[PDB]
Design a protein around this ligand. Structure first.
Ligand code: MG
Ligand code: MG
Ligand code: MG
Ligand code: ZN
Ligand code: ZN
Lengths: 74, 192, 101, 124, 93, 99, 54, 124
RNA sequence: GGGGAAACUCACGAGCGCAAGACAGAGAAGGGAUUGACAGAUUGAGAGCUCUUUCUUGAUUCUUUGGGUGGUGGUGCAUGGCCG
């Protein structure tokens, strides 16, 4: 256990260390209000989803990344 | 005659030849299920029968892998072109071949398909092909950084006795992951 | 260490003609067939796999190299005119099937 | 026109003899290659600076026995030899010019008619 | 178990011979007259002779190819040694 | 006998060298600091695992800005790392290292 | 000028030989001229045709 | 091939119109030369950076009346104009790239067939 | 630990040599990248190792910026396999 650089117990350590990563600029925007719950209904409780096997229904966040949105659309 | 060789020293040398071949073929043939090799030796020729599950990949695209292999043995030992012959022979029942099935789960585990499901798939296959019993052992890190060992049995199994060497067929593979080497044995007890 | 031009050419020649190359590990000895000092082979072939024209398999002290289609295209280049004609013994398609019942 | 047949046969010859070991390149190389009477035919770059290079070379071709050719520009020699730094677009940019080239032997893929074409430009 | 120690320097670092090359120097071998005659003002090697020139170090003639060594009479040797010495004393200062 | 050689680490800014004085418990100790102050140190979660520390050992100590009176035990020095420290001229030559 | 490389005689003793498979010099089995270390042998043994009856 | 006839006739034209005063060079020059309807034909350099230059120029050719040609590289424009820094070996090294060229009038040594060759590349 | 080690083995120690630093980008190179080596010193050593000395050699590439080979180096409490 011979790797040590910073003093133990320094206050801001982990937050200061963390690189600043910028929030991605979104093409267009996220609809506010009713329209959003429309969007949700569509991608979640809509007829086609219901028609599929309820035990095989796919969980809402399964994809973090876009490669599986490409695998989902195919 | 070529050289007078010790029947003992010759025969050991023949066995060592055979083993070098088996290591070579299991190593370079790794995609098509490779089971065995049978070597007939004629003053004229050396005939090698490669017993395999997918002969089609032994040949390749119009003898790409075949010609490659044949030439490999040629440069390696030195041989006349009439002196070497390679045949590929199909194993009619893939479910009775271990090395094959272990290659199967090698494959399935590379694609991140879960353990129990894969193990079950192959086991069900093996018994579907009429094998009385089968077992699979997967060892190494599965869950976590601490090593586990998981066994999957179904059907009939013998371990001990001379019958072991007869009815039981075994193969192992090393499987590679970002985390390290995990490893997999398949014991298929054959039918009578 | 210098790998001479004719060395280079000789091995590229044998590659393209055969389509396959084999190397025992010892950097001392010579390559049986082409009769080339092994260090030199190791070097040429090393670069060749490092650019991907060559695919490598290792068995009992012996490294086995087999040529890819990118290979034909490299050897055409360095050997020039001569290689207009040739396709390697590997690339030549076999006309008869070896699978037996 | 530089007579495109001349530059084309020159190009094919210098390439061929480079893919085979028997070309020779450089003022020290061309020197001994001329003197050993190894060089069957030799190429001189016309534009370049030291009066010596051209004088000595032409004089050495004359002073054992060698036929020579005169190329106007050096970058052309470098290009023919396949000395170029190639861009990823397939564009040849950086070219190190040569001065003298000595071809020791000819490659068998040389056409008879091409050789008969060479022989005409070989003066002195 | 044991571990490799941090390295200890005993003796001073050594440098490797670079390759001395005089640029376009190959022209120093030949001289031309008004007639156009080609004159060789170096010495060629009896085994390698047509194109290869030997080396004149003060006391020796040395072939870069066959490593031929031809030792001079000692007087020429001492004279050339003395001269080159007296010249280097000048260039270095 | 020893654990793998790793570079002797110096006092970075915000740390001080220390020598163990007496044992407290709960993984605590009193240390004499070469800052010249006594402090009451706590032992690292790292060190609680690996290196057992005892009396009169020479230790590196990570300090605290706010409470100067407490300090964290960072790392223990092997007697060789110590004799080396004395060589380098970090800590004073008159110090008692016991085996 | 690598001339001195490997120039000490390996003619005989431990360095004259090695396992054909794993290239170990240690505990090599030379007995039928089979040049295989004990571990490697133990592995190849059924492929070489060596049974354990006993 | 860029169609060597196109680049050759382009070269001869840009040279001719430079030896005679009637060529015009530069984004301020080409501007007023286009707008005064003086420019009979105009050349645009494709690779270059400000979206404006190409957009404005092509649009200005369209917006009075002018036919234009598209050259892939700028160094070629500079070379054609005879903007080059020439080495004493007759080697052209430093070349300042251009962007837009406006040819006000044509020099009488222009061949009919060459002009008829130009007219085909003049689109938009 | 096939662990009977004179070299080798061999990881240890003292002193010396090579690159087998691929592959990619930048610059350098054919008007020269680089290899080699008599001989005198030098060295334990006909190691061209170094230094003086030049002659050879002819892209086999050199300097940086990345980066791979290689490692009887660590970790069996990261692991396979094998074995108690
Ligand atoms: Mg012992
Ligand atoms: Mg590694
Ligand atoms: Mg070592
Ligand atoms: Zn000689
Ligand atoms: Zn072994």
């Amino acid at each position: 256990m011979g790797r040590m650089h910073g003093t133990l117990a320094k206050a801001g350590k982990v937050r200061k260390q963390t690189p600043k990563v910028e929030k991605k600029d979104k093409p267009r925007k996220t609809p506010k209000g009713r329209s959003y719950k429309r969007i949700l209904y569509n991608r979640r409780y809509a007829p086609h989803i219901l028609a599929t096997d309820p035990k095989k229904r796919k969980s809402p966040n399964w994809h973090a990344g876009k490669k599986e949105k490409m695998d989902a659309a195919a | 005659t070529t050289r007078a060789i010790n029947k003992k020293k010759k025969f050991v040398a023949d066995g060592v030849f055979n083993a070098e071949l088996h290591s070579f073929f299991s190593k370079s043939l790794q995609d098509a299920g490779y089971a065995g090799i049978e070597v007939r030796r004629t003053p004229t020729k050396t005939e090698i029968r490669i017993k395999a599950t997918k002969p089609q990949q032994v040949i390749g695209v119009e003898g790409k892998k075949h010609k490659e292999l044949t030439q490999f043995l040629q440069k390696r030992f030195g041989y006349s072109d009439d002196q070497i012959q390679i045949w590929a022979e199909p194993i009619k029942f893939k479910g009775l071949c271990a090395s094959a099935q272990v290659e199967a789960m090698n494959y399935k585990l590379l694609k991140d398909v879960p353990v129990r499901l894969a193990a079950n798939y192959i086991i069900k296959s093996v018994i579907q092909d009429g094998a009385k019993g089968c077992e699979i052992i997967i060892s190494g890190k599965l869950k976590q950084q601490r090593a586990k060992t998981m066994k999957f049995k179904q059907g009939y199994m013998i371990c001990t006795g001379q019958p072991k060497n007869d009815y039981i067929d075994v193969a192992v593979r090393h499987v590679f992951f970002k985390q390290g080497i995990m490893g997999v044995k398949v014991k298929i007890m054959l039918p009578y | 260490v210098h790998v001479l031009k004719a060395t280079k050419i000789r091995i590229y020649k044998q590659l393209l003609q055969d389509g396959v190359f084999v190397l025992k590990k010892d950097f001392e000895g010579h390559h049986e067939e082409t009769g080339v000092p092994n260090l030199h082979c190791y070097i040429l072939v090393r670069s060749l796999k490092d650019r991907g024209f060559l695919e490598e398999i290792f068995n009992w002290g012996f490294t086995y190299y087999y040529l890819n289609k990118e290979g034909c295209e490299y050897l055409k280049t360095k050997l020039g005119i001569s290689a207009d004609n040739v396709i390697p013994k590997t690339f030549k398609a076999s006309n008869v099937n070896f699978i037996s019942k | 026109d530089q007579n495109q047949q001349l530059n084309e046969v020159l190009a094919k010859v210098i390439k061929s003899s480079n893919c085979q070991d028997a070309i020779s390149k450089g003022l020290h190389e061309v020197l001994r290659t001329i003197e050993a009477k190894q060089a069957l035919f030799v190429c001189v770059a016309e534009d370049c600076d030291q009066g010596n290079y051209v004088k000595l070379v032409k004089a050495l071709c004359a002073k054992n026995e060698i036929k020579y050719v005169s190329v106007p520009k050096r970058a052309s020699l470098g290009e023919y030899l396949g000395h170029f730094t190639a861009n990823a677009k397939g564009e040849i940019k950086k070219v190190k010019g040569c001065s003298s080239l000595a071809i020791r032997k000819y490659a068998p893929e040389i056409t008879e008619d091409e050789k008969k074409i060479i022989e005409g430009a070989l003066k002195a | 178990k044991k571990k490799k120690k941090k390295k200890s320097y005993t003796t001073k670092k050594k440098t490797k011979h670079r390759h001395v090359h005089t640029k376009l120097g190959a022209l120093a071998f030949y001289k031309l007259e008004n007639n156009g005659k080609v004159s060789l003002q170096q010495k060629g090697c009896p085994k390698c002779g047509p194109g290869i020139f030997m080396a004149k170090h003060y006391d020796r003639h040395y072939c870069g190819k066959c490593h031929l060594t031809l030792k001079i009479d000692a007087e020429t040797a001492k004279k050339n040694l003395e001269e080159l010495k007296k010249k280097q004393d000048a260039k270095k200062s | 006998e020893n654990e793998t050689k790793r570079e002797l680490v110096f006092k970075e800014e915000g740390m001080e060298y220390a020598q163990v004085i007496k044992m407290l418990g709960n993984g605590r100790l009193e240390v004499f600091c070469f800052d010249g102050k006594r402090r009451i140190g706590h032992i690292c979660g790292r060190l609680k695992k690996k290196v057992w520390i005892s009396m009169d050992d020479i230790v590196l100590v990570g300090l605290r800005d706010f409470q100067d009176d407490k300090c964290d035990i960072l790392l223990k020095y092997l007697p060789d790392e110590v004799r080396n420290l004395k060589q380098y001229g970090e800590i004073d030559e008159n110090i008692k290292i016991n085996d | 000028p690598n001339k001195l490389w490997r120039t000490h005689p390996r003619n005989y003793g431990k360095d004259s030989k090695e396992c054909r498979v794993c290239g170990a010099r240690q505990g090599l089995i030379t007995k039928y001229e089979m040049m295989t270390c004990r571990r490697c042998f133990r592995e190849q043994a059924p492929h070489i045709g060596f049974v354990k009856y006993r």
